[PDB]
Amino acid sequence: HWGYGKHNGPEHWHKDFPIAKGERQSPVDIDTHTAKYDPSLKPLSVSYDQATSLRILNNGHAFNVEFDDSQDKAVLKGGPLDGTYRLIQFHFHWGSLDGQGSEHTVDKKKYAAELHLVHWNTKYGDFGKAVQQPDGLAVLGIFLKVGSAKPGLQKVVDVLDSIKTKGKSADFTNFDPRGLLPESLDYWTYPGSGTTPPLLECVTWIVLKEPISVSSEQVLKFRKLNFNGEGEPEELMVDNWRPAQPLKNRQIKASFK
Ligand SMILES: Oc1cccccc1=S
Ligand SMILES: [Zn+2]
Numbered sequence: 718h719w720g721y722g723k724h725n726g727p728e729h730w731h732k733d734f735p736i737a738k739g740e741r742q743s744p745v746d747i748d749t750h751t752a753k754y755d756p757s758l759k760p761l762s763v764s765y766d767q768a769t770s771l772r773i774l775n776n777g778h779a780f781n782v783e784f785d786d787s788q789d790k791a792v793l794k795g796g797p798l799d800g801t802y803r804l805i806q807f808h809f810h811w812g813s814l815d816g817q818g819s820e821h822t823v824d825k826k827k828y829a830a831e832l833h834l835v836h837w838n839t840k841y842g843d844f845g846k847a848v849q850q851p852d853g854l855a856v857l858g859i860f861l862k863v864g865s866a867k868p869g870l871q872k873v874v875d876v877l878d879s880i881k882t883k884g885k886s887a888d889f890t891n892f893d894p895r896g897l898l899p900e901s902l903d904y905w906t907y908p909g910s911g912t913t914p915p916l917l918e919c920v921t922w923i924v925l926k927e928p929i930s931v932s933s934e935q936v937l938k939f940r941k942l943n944f945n946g947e948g949e950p951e952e953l954m955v956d957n958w959r960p961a962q963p964l965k966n967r968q969i970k971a972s973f974k
Contacts, residue, residue, distance in 0.1 A: 719914045727959050734914045741918045742962040743909030744820035752969040761902045762795035770892040777883035781806040793836045797906045802836035802855040811939050813955040815863045820958045830861035853919035866932035869896020874938045882947040899927035903973040912959045
């Protein structure tokens with residue numbers, strides 16, 4: 718099955734998931750000089766005051782912080798979006814080294830990691846239906862650079878010992894995702910896809926310009942997680958990122974000059 722290794726990594730995924738070579742795949746390089754400022758783009762509305770986190774899961778490819786999405790509690794709207802998108806989970810992609818790990822790049826620059834806050838369009842009722850629609854998901858992408866610690870990340874880092882291996886979960890209530898956001902909500906936006914199989918082309922990407930800083934110790938702890946199950950040979954969960962894919966017939970828009 719798919720993964721991030723030599724024999725089952727991103728260069729292989731097209732054999733089981735032919736959409737890997739499609740017309741609106743993600744991630745992409747964000748060429749900041751080529752992105753066009755769109756003064757009609759609205760400010761992003763991030764409404765996380767009532768977010769209800771539930772659980773954290775190691776799925777064998779990343780860890781997901783899951784939310785109660787059975788009511789409009791943590792929603793994204795505005796920006797390039799029409800309508801209301803509910804937060805279902807967040808996750809990260811990260812490197813073996815601080816010089817790599819992000820999926821999106823900025824003028825070819827790679828960040829140490831990238832946080833994806835996954836939201837689904839409430840006009841489609843559930844996440845599973847939404848992923849079959851070209852406007853089904855909105856993913857807020859935030860870059861991580863190594864420097865000062867992010868205090869609001871530390872509760873995540875502290876639980877990772879309890880979900881070291883594939884299939885482990887832990888209760889993870891009362892986590893406030895507002896503590897992972899940078900100051901500015903200036904963004905880039907384009908149409909694309911999930912970055913893991915099944916690579917469905919259902920995502921409006923919203924990539925914040927301003928990274929967050931995390932400490933070297935925080936991202937070190939991400940790198941101690943395992944892709945394997947308990948009792949299987951240890952394979953560190955590192956370099957779980959897809960490289961940039963061809964832009965094809967797409968324009969990246971900027972909310973800012
Ligand atoms: O990595 C992902 C995993 C699962 C669902 C939706 C979006 C992304 S980027
Ligand atoms: Zn992702």
